[PDB]
Amino acid sequence: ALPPSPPAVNLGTAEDFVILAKAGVTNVPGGAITGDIGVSPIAASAMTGFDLVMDSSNEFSTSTEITGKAYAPDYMSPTGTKLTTAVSDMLTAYNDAAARPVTGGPFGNSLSGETYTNLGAGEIGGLTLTRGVYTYDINVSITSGKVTFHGGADDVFIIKTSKSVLQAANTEVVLTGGAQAKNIFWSVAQEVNVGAGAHMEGILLVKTAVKFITGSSFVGRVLSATAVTLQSAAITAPATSAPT
Template identity: 45%
Template sequence: MLSNTFIPAFLTLLGGAAALGPAAVNLGTAGNYTILAETGITTVPPSVITGPIAVSPIGAAAMTGWSQTLDSSGKFSTSTQVTGDLFAADYANPTPPTLTIAIADMGTAYGDATGRTSPNFTNLGSGLIGGLTLTPGLYNWATAVSIGSDITISGAATDTWIFQVTGTLTVGSAVRMTLSGGARAANIVWVVTDSITAGSTSHLEGVFLGKTSITLDTGSTANSRLLAQTLVALQSATVTAPS
């Protein structure tokens, strides 16, 4: 049986189709949230978020800029900037234990993604990957990664990607990640040991597992889940959870 660390060049069968790439990262209940963070989620309004957002173990005071209204049940709040509910560790039960599990699942997913071995691509472009087309597989950089011009993530709908970044991940202003060949953002995982920054009017694709902060600057967009072990900071950004 193939393990979670098999070489990406191998094929697996998903729904009868041959799929390229590593075994998928299981997000567990962390995958229920468009944005999940441990120390806060801030916005310079207006941001536009599709899907629920949550903070834990910190409380609702760490969600700033949302002008949220607490529901009469005390279990969640709402905001005109979010199509979905807002959750915090100091809301009424069952929200606190539910979020504790989600945070644990986020940590497990991060550990899984960082722990994959035998990468198909190592230190590609010495961390400068602007202009490249990225095919399915496991990628590893022992350095920071900078994306200074548009990239394409190309593969079939059943293919998978894991991008392991040891250091920061920086996406330049107006730089776009584009999917081709049927590639799905839900099958793309960026796991980053330091901060993640998307410049103004840039566009992201995939699930972002950040050891520290995730920042989306003015006018940036993301077809993404943003799962951070510290803060997610948005400045008039648009984030939609990938299907």
Template identity: 45%
Template sequence: MKNKNLLSTLAIAMVVLFTGCSNDDTTQSDSVPTVALTSPSSSDTNVARNKVVSVKFSSEMDVSSINTTTFTLKQAGTPVLGSVSYSGTTAKFVPLTVLAANTVYTAALSTGVKSANGVALSLNKQWEFTTTANATAGLAAVGLGSAGNYVVLAKTAITNVPTSVITGDLALSPAATSFITGLSLTDFTGYAKAAQVTGKVFAADMVSPTSTNLTTAVENMITAYNDAAGRPSPDFVELGAGSIGGKTLTPGLYKWTSTVTVPTNVTISGSADDVWIFQISGDLSMSAATRIILQGGAKASNIFWQVAGKATFGTTSHVEGIILSKTGVTFQTGASFNGRALAQTAVILDGNTVVQPQ
């Protein structure tokens, strides 16, 4: 009888133990996501009028749940037009135009925002900030939409000569997976993985919703290119007759009607809220071992190279910024890149270090 009671007690204890472990695992994997940081912060004042509103989450989120319906910016109840992108654990709202001076804006996230595990924010989040009274406004950043979810996005091919080190997601559309070469892909459902990529690899022939997501991303890439190319009233025209080596570039809109070359180092100098847009009607060519150097808090995510021709970065060179190319992007052997390569044709890699911007 004692043995029977002992066995019953042990059986109950095991049930409790395993039930408890199962609940712990479920709680850990399905934890409610939170907002770790916002920029601007709540009640911030003197915020730059070209500010990109960003949110950092406590965990990886479901990119499809973060859009202009769930992440909004309003002024006195009126929606501000803009685009939304998500990368890493950070979502960004990019206003279409500069914000009004000395004005209160309200940013908001709804409970439609979900973690990668499908768990929604527990409450709607809302916060306010006030823009600077300074009437002079800088450029508004170029909104990338869902194209901003990828460190490399191309339409016709992504070609790699091993071994590259890539941080961020790669995507190809409308071309199929077979046009991604040199990465030794391992297929998963709706995406692939590669040893050279810290992130995921997507192509148009992968299962839904990947194909639909990529169609939207390519459309957003083209819209971003047209936005950058169409900005009026440049601050600098034909600077250096297209040869910009050795120059320090302050914030603003730059325009060239021919090829731009970078034969020696270039410094891009400004604050974290400043924006640079380079409109290049020809090619962009960067010489071997040259560097784009950021100074004063300037951020790669606010630098836009709109290139109608080919963008070529020489051996062991280093470039910063968002490349919006109509004709293709080539990184030669050992070149490094902090930014996003968004090409309406192909992106060619050769033993490169590629990192998505913060």
């Protein structure tokens, strides 16, 4: 029997971005970004490796590797306001996610001897996670294989850690049951590192850095209070296979 689904974490206008980073985005060509990116309060020059061309409006820039638009505070109004509102909404979302109570009681069978606190001693590779709030004071690791999020279309999954999320190379986040990437929230006080060729899903609400190593892929949003590093990575917003 499941716990109730937690409420989804409101991202407000931060949902308008696939990457929002306060201290920059660095890219090694030729991954592919589907969605819009933004930086604030750092200047545009902290988006490197996208060969950005200003639009004639001077409100945004475009790239060969971004399907959408890039936004920075030194661009024309209303871009700076758009960015500042999104960064504030990111902070609110980070704080809300971090404030969610852990789901109570045993995880899996009532005599599993394990709970939603420090589940797997931080290793979640090979686990099936159902809806709820999982809390960690240790790194969360995906060392080998897959982690599965299983639930319905509106079920919510929140993974909180005071440390980092370390996803080894060539591992996968898998969704089953109707579970959607927009309803998975990773609340991370340190960093998120996604190894080479690995596949991550969900909303990354990260206090510090996020790194996507060579050839990794992602469905979700990267919402970082510091900097984002992309190494020939596929970064896709949720639901962009529908008409846009």
